[PDB]
Design a protein around this ligand. Structure first.
Ligand SMILES: *[C@@H]1O[C@H](CO)[C@@H](O)[C@H](O)[C@H]1NC(C)=O
Ligand SMILES: *[C@@H]1O[C@H](CO)[C@@H](O)[C@H](O)[C@H]1NC(C)=O
Ligand SMILES: *[C@@H]1O[C@H](CO)[C@@H](O)[C@H](O)[C@H]1NC(C)=O
Ligand SMILES: *[C@@H]1O[C@H](CO)[C@@H](O)[C@H](O)[C@H]1NC(C)=O
Lengths: 314, 163, 111, 163
């Protein structure tokens, strides 16, 4: 008898320890190159922030009205998403972003901060719905009517819930010292924020700034995390953006930063700016920053795992 | 698969097969046990490999608003080192599992070859090209008997010893 | 949209499970927010009806922990782990996903 | 371990052995050289594997008072990536050394089998089940000589060629 094996005319070139580019009868994919350019994530709760930014849901610009107290297991950020209406910047920005991405949505619980002797309805031309207005959960605390001494106020909020609250507030650095005296009065304003693990304090600093979003002054958006059974104290002499509703975490989510539209046609596992990586393969060469339980990044364009034998043509 | 001149192209259903070229005619059949074992081993290796990760990774770097430059370079360098070691591990694993797949195919091939040797004491011997020279004539029955692993050699010994 | 409720007043004693069911004609869930719009109110006799929970799962600051709201697409539930004399009231489930706000029919609790 | 129907359960002292079924009776013996080589190789593999590392890591994260959230999440992500790569390397190492120990046992069995066939030129042949069919009569001295690698086949050729 004659004993032999099988072969094909056209096989696949695979990499091997001894030789590179050996010819096999059949081989399978290893690195996943096929990318789905859609966030198809059926079976999971999903919010598409769009023009809203992740931090904006904490503070509430007009673009973040829809997603102010959302709840989802998949948070999708966009490059067009802005975090603020009035110009400003969050200090320790990425820490708050990573806290928000693992929140499962946020809730707003009122602080009960009543105010006497000051005017609390802040109004800016930049943060516009129907006129000069401000954020959702922030009161820009002005003076009474005009240049006048802002009273030194100590306001305490105690987190009575069983989960750690996310406290946020803002600091207004006016476009000039004259504007600061117009809004809060003369004198060196000084604000302290006290907690069990937070003791940072600061002084507002008026000065000229480039006109961002049609405004000169900037709001430093500070934040902290309150443990259960813990109280925070804001002692402000002036120039304050007081919170109205403390932010509260809900659960566990996984936040992405994509640029493609959302659908519900896949049992997708990890997502990135290019879309969704649906694959059971061990490795991928689509994006190095895909987050989730999925194939992992490699440098090789394409790896061939040999499934058949070393074929030789007849 | 080293001492064989070439692999058969007409063998479609089975990975390892048999040819006769006896006086009855010409026939190309396929073995079942060796190819089933080889496909089972290779598919088990694939199922071990084809496994999505359990560990959950979160976003550590921001694409839109760039993070602080020192911690940004720290994240970039950590991800670059992890990417390099993962590319290394992937190419190393692919190379050695392709080597083990080729060696497993060769091992199943010469295991079938040696079991055909074991079934044929002196009624047949090798030629060096992967063929066995049968010293007895049967009407395609002992062909299947070798194929079905139900071959009796003791009844064919008397006419094959003197040749 | 019509807003149904549970059966009538429950003869439950102190410190036991109290279950009130709410059902909707349409779906008051999502809207790209996945937040299932539904408010729960308790009303003491002679006092205005103060809110218990909002979006059927967010417990308010001024209410005890015993009021737990379970939500879904259509069915909703208020559960009280240990009712006492301070929880006797009439309860309403209110939808606010759609503009004609219809309150519940009222679910009085009886000691 | 391929052509054997089933491994022996009555063999305790060694790993590879011999069964007798001769005219003197039935007896079981244990080979010494092949099992010594196999155990030496596998224990050397264990010794080069069972080793506490020299690198001495330090405490990077605080369990009691949580560190800053950005650098803390960077530490968590680095530790999770290193945990994933170490788990992958551990599965890879365990799988490939289990495969290598199985192949080493098979190769030690094969080496003993080929050395037994090399000791006995035509005096014995395989049957396919792992046994050798002796064509000469000898009362446990020839077989112990086979075990002792002192087999003199030259004085047994005359009565085994005609059979
Ligand atoms: C060849 O391998 C691929 C895996 O990519 C598989 O889908 C296909 O069925 C295989 N074909 C044969 C003939 O084995
Ligand atoms: C805070 O108060 C709640 C209820 O008032 C209590 O259950 C909790 O134990 C308190 N925290 C500590 C640390 O005692
Ligand atoms: C870090 O790597 C990403 C690609 O994964 C790149 O877009 C980014 O620019 C890098 N960061 C720096 C600071 O180079
Ligand atoms: C980092 O990992 C440890 C356990 O490995 C865990 O206890 C801790 O909470 C993690 N840190 C964060 C910020 O999740």
């Amino acid at each position: 008898i004659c004993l032999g094996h099988h072969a094909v005319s056209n096989g696949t070139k695979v990499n091997t320890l001894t030789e590179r580019g050996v010819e096999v009868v059949n081989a399978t994919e290893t690195v996943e190159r096929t990318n789905v350019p859609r966030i198809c994530s059926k079976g999971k709760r999903t919010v598409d922030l769009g023009q809203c930014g992740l931090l904006g849901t904490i503070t509430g610009p007009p673009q973040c009205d829809q997603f102010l107290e959302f709840s989802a297991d998949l948070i999708i950020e966009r490059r067009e998403g802005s975090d603020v209406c009035y110009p400003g910047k969050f200090v320790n920005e990425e820490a708050l972003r990573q806290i928000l991405r693992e929140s499962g949505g946020i809730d707003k619980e009122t602080m009960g901060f009543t105010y006497s002797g000051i005017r609390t309805n802040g109004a800016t031309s930049a943060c516009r719905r129907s006129g000069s207005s401000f954020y959702a959960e922030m009161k820009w605390l002005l003076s009474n009517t005009d240049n006048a001494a802002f009273p030194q106020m100590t306001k305490s909020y105690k987190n009575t819930r069983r989960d750690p609250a996310l406290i946020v507030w803002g600091i207004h650095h006016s476009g000039s010292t004259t504007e600061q005296t117009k809004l809060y009065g003369s004198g060196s304003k000084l604000i302290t924020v006290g907690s069990s693990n937070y003791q940072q304090s600061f002084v507002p600093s008026p000065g000229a700034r480039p006109q961002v979003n049609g405004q000169s002054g900037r709001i430093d958006f500070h934040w902290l995390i309150l443990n259960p059974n813990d109280t925070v104290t804001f002692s402000f002499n002036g120039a304050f953006i007081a919170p109205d509703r403390a932010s509260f975490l809900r659960g566990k989510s996984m936040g992405i930063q994509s640029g493609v539209q959302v659908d519900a046609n896949c049992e997708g596992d990890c997502y990135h700016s290019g879309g969704t990586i649906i694959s059971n393969l061990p490795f991928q060469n689509i994006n190095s920053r895909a987050v989730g339980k999925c194939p992992r990044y490699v440098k090789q364009e394409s790896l061939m795992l040999a499934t058949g034998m070393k074929n030789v043509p007849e | 698969a080293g001492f064989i001149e070439n692999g058969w192209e007409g063998l479609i259903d089975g990975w390892y097969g048999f040819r006769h070229q006896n006086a009855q005619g010409e026939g190309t059949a396929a073995d079942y046990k060796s190819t089933q074992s080889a496909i089972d081993q290779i598919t088990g290796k694939l199922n071990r490999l084809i496994e999505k990760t359990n560990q959950q990774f979160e976003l550590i770097d921001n694409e839109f608003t760039e993070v602080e430059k020192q911690i940004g370079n720290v994240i970039n360098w950590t991800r670059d080192s992890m990417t390099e070691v993962w590319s290394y591990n992937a190419e190393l694993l692919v190379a050695m599992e392709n080597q083990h797949t080729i060696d497993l195919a060769d091992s199943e091939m010469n295991k079938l070859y040696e079991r055909v040797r074991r079934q044929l004491r002196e009624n047949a011997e090798e030629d060096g090209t992967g063929c066995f020279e049968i010293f007895h004539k049967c009407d395609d029955d002992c062909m299947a008997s070798i194929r079905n692993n139900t071959y009796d050699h003791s009844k064919y010994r008397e006419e094959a010893m003197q040749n | 949209i019509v807003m149904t409720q549970s059966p009538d007043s429950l003869a439950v004693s102190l410190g036991e499970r109290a279950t009130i069911n709410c059902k909707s004609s349409q779906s008051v869930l999502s809207g790209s927010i996945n937040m299932n719009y539904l408010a729960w109110y308790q009303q003491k006799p002679g006092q205005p009806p103060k809110l218990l929970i909002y979006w059927a799962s967010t417990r308010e600051s001024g209410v005890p922990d015993r009021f737990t709201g379970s939500g879904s697409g259509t069915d909703f539930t208020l559960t009280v782990s240990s009712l006492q004399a301070e929880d006797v009231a009439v309860y309403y489930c209110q939808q606010y996903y759609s503009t004609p706000l219809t309150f519940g029919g009222g679910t009085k609790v009886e000691i």
